[PDB]
Amino acid sequence: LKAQTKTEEFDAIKIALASPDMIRSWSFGEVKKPETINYRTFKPERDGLFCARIFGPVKDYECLCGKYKRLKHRGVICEKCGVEVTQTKVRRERMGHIELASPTAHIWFLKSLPSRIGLLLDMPLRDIERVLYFESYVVIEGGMTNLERQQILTEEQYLDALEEFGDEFDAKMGAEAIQALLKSMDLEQECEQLREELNETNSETKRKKLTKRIKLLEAFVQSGNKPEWMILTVLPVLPPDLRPLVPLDGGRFATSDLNDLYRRVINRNNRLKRLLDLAAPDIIVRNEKRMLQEAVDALLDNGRRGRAITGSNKRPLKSLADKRVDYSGRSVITVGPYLRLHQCGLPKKMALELFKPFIYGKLELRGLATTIKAAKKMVEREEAVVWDILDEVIREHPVLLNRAPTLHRLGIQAFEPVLIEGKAIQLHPLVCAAYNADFDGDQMAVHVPLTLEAQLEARALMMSTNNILSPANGEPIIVPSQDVVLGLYYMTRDCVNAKGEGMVLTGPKEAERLYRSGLASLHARVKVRITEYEKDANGELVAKTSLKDTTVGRAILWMIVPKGLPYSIVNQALGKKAISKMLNTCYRILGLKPTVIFADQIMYTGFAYAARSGASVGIDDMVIPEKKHEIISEAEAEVAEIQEQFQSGLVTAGERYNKVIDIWAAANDRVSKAMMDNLQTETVINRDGQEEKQVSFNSIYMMADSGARGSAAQIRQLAGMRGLMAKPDGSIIETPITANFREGLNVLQYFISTHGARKGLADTALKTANSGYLTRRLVDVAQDLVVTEDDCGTHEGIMMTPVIEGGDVKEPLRDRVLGRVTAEDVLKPGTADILVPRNTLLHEQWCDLLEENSVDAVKVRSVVSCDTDFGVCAHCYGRDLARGHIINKGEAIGVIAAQSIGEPGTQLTTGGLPRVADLFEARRPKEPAILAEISGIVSFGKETKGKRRLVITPVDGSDPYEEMIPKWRQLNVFEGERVERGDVISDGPEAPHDILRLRGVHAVTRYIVNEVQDVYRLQGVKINDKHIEVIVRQMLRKATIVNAGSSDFLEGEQVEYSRVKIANRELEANGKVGATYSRDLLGITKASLATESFISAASFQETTRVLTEAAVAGKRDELRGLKENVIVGRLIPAGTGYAYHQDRMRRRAAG
Amino acid sequence: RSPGVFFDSDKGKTHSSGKVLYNARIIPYRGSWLDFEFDPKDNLFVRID
Amino acid sequence: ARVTVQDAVEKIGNRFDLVLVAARRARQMQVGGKDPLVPEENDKTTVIALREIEEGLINNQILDVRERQEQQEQEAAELQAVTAIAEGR
Amino acid sequence: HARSTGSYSLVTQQPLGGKAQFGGQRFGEMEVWALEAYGAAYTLQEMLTVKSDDVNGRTKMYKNIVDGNHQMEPGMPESFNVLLKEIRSLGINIELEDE
Amino acid sequence: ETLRVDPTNDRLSALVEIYRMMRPGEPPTREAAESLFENLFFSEDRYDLS
Amino acid sequence: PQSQLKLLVTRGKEQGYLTYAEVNDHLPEDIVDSDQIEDIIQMINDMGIQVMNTADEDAAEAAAQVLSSVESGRTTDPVRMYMREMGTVELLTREGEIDIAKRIEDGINQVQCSVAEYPEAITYLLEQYDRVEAEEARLSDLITGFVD
């Protein structure tokens, strides 16, 4: 079958140099005149920057002169002025050209610091430029006489050399010279010489540059490009519609600067033609040629040179080198607690305007409207019927909600529209956590999933209820926020004595019946008969009932708790954490739907009982310690004691300072732990006896304790004194703020407080941008990484143990191994007993079985060790997602990894967020420790010059290794003792490169993850090891070959490519010629630099250099990646489109 | 910044030597700036603007 | 409405293939070549297709079989028509 | 604010409010990452092709929307086409290979 | 030491180096160096501290 | 005692960072250009960046930078190269003008006399005037007038 010619769905893309004829191919005419339009009848002047003949008609299917105006005549070229009558859109398509009188250098190739003409000719830049401006001659193919080929001469020198040799010697100057140079150049011969010369002389300096240049040359050859094309003969002109002359109000016009530039180029070129026909002296024509070069250079890229300015406007004209979406909206948002988790309140008018086409279609579908026009007129009139029609089109049609600072994927969530009277969008409270959306006037945006696939994608993926879990860690993101948790807290709780204390009831029904009638208090100690279930039978619910000692409120709350959950979960005090673990267990036990509806009911009851609770905040609710004033007085004794000591000279200045600052710092803690006790347990009440005491029912304490809002620090600042403040210098004042917010703050105290406020605001505002930037670098380094294969089937993995830092368990084993697959079957303390067989996803039950037994460690498969090339297999990755099931095939994990790492990054403050940055960047620390290069006994050699050399002595092996260690740095290593490779030869931080090379891949992959996780966990942030492990996988992607037999020696190349080539070379081919390598750690920003697709790279990298460097190589972008397919505007090679791209990829490169 | 003469330091970061540095700057209401500045070699310099 | 696609995901495990297949079915119904396999509650073709996935009476295998059958349903019609095109000889 | 189908920019065809009828909301890179994190390709394609930058795709879609047929015949976004022309206007030859 | 790093010798030489520093690329002139340098900080027109 | 550009380089490397102002003055007196810096910040930035995070490769980012240091004279800006190129041509003397003009006269009169010595150059004019009086042409398109 004949392949194809006319437009199909294309694959890949190719970029290369353009031939003069190739350029003329695109051009449908030459633009010979600087003129644009006629100035009276605004029609385009023929063959000018704007032309109907060359480019296209000014109006659809209408000839310029107006001969053929009919839609019938089409392929007709008019006789008066040749214009094919066709849509005016082809004036946005057809290109043009200009035939340049003299050759002109292409400024991108001339100066883009790989000066391409230069390093292709092995000729320095200044020589090339000196030639181009006619400031000197350059030899070309000098033959056998006196002179080198690339050698440059001057006026006198050229004259003399010419007088000596008339022929068999050649020299030119200007653009023509460079062109002749390039054209004359034979790549083949140069290669043949370079190979021999490479082989003969042995020096690093020589053959390094030699091999680099031969590689460049052969690359350029295989490219298909020819050197001549670097020098411009024909200059293509951009279609007129892309540089519009379009009019405006008041008769004035407006136009692109490209018209000014192109006009300049055309004028100077024409003047050059004339000056050639007029036979001007050289001094003139040279100047005109230089001016033409300037004009063209300014036209292409005006960035370089002196930056020519547009007419009458100082601002430099924008040169060639130099998204809004329909069906959308936005507004201020409100609460709407009545909403179910799967829906959101959508304003009437908004939904009307948004679904307008749907409404038209449905309206004339049922027959309510004669035609579409009538439908428009109907909804424009807002006739009463259309509303009901809208209710039809809204029902099963989801909408997308989005907030401004989008970080993690939950930043956009799909809901089901519920028509609302008002202009505000009602957003479900439980989602307010995911969005990071307060109600202080934050606005949200709505989108409409037009296509069927978009509706189903919205419902099965982006839906609210389908994502109940943070992608960062398995913990529920639907956790009740504030009012609700204060509700369940006030509900589930007990005081010492209350109505119905001690009585007994048949069940929750009459418990609530007792409460609502005012007979029994919400919180009272009571024994009630409850029936709790358990699914502990195989796939089956077991029922049991008993007398539980609980409170009225907890009994009432139990009515909500579904099925197999134990009563024990609602028998606590019900804080935010317990109220979260409740939902979590509910999810890992009953499944999704029960968890959803449970969460809803929890919110409703929370708000209800919080409302009933009558919880408020008064000024007497914040209790200042009675002993505060006394503590103040005592520390104030300390300060004058130390003062009197400084006056007697017993203590120094700095010592006095530290002492006073310490005594105040202690005073703060004293007052704090006074007010805390007083605000905590001080309620003293009586049940049938004298007295007794319990946790206070005081409001603000309830808020802070439940987890609704407020915290011990802030409560500390309300009641007790607040801190010691520090100057902008960062020195901390030794006279702290003794007054608190409840008390009045005098002038000073406030003024000293202000700095802290502003530095606070500023720093937060800055860390916003920092977090964002980090997220950007992270998504750039990952992106295209997506689950591709299913199971790679490697036994390889990392050893998971609890962190055990200092004292007991800074993080457990169960957390680290949860949701992860086992590398190999692990064992009980006794063996021939396989509890967890081979590779099995370790879920809650499994991890609990591991917890039953005493197991201290589990080998776990990771994304960093996965044998799959160009991606990750689902088996290795893990489970975690919005769903508890194992990761789907085709889900893009790099994006969610980066998102999950960067989202909490706002909460981060060596240490802090810049520490995370430094870690991922692989940067060597300021004052690093040096590891032992090789095992064996060591000794200190030579003497002091800049360094004192350390000589290693391996037992069996040789000792060529001697490392020169600067001696002014105090050492560690024992000069009379043996040290293993990767031991401490000094203290201080260690470069991850060293950890990788000397210790191992798993060693460094552990170092990174543990360090960044130290940073996050120190700030109380949950991020699963997975994501960081994928970022690490991307960090170590490259490697440097050591041995040979296939590829070049020092080449940095993909571990995927390499391993693919050696595993392919271990069999067939040479028996094994397979080459060794060395894994290499690359910082995220550096690893991001490496991408196969040039369309992708042209995005985030420097555009000019990328396009050029790709163009000279004739690089063919096959797409295959996310970014490039986004740019080109087709289905992402992941997720829903993964099947497509799969299928197509298989159809391609095949029969 | 008020017109007049101004004496600054730029201690620390400059050339990471801890040797600090010292610079004077004459800022007119309207006109060219007259800058004087040292270097690690203790050689006084002057720059207009 | 269909609040949770968990069951539909349970049937066909990929969950993206869920969206793809359910899209195909929803298309079979939306521009009518066909009719629902489950009672329509006024649920749009989207939700109807999802329900059809839940009840296990719709999936890639089934749809492909049906379509491949229809190819021959139409092929049996044109059997005289296209064999009448012996003019190519 | 709300918009279904409004006016469009001349230079690059993109939604632009000219009547005080507002232009569509801007879909950013981070939002594209959000759609990328979800397995939703079609939502993204229709987001940056048919709903916005495709001069043919928008009308060809609208007719289907009113016809009662939810589909998309995406074609190529006008921005990347403009970029094809801008790159090709230089000495750079950019081609679309195969079939 | 500063004088030791001074490439110039007399008044005119210093004026040439200053003029070349301010407006490089173009040939210096005696009247140009004098005019410039006197017009910088010493002119009632081009300079005021008020 | 001399070679300039090494020092801003060798220092910029040892400090690990240099202010955007640090390179400007430390640059040799050779390259003063404004748009010069634009790509050299990228050059130093891929090998040890300070734009006030890079590639550890270095190597060729120095050899080419030195190639940019040798490329630091001719400031391009064709106004300059022109003004200088024409500035070479010597001024004319009042008599020299007469010399040159006389040479012109000799030349043009030579070619005119060479034309007059061609028989076909005569016959053509005759036939053309035969076309003029035949209303196949006009007097203005043949002669601009004789001497007169």
Ligand SMILES: [Mg+2]
């Ligand atoms: Mg806010």
Ligand SMILES: [Zn+2]
């Ligand atoms: Zn015509």
Ligand SMILES: [Zn+2]
């Ligand atoms: Zn794997």
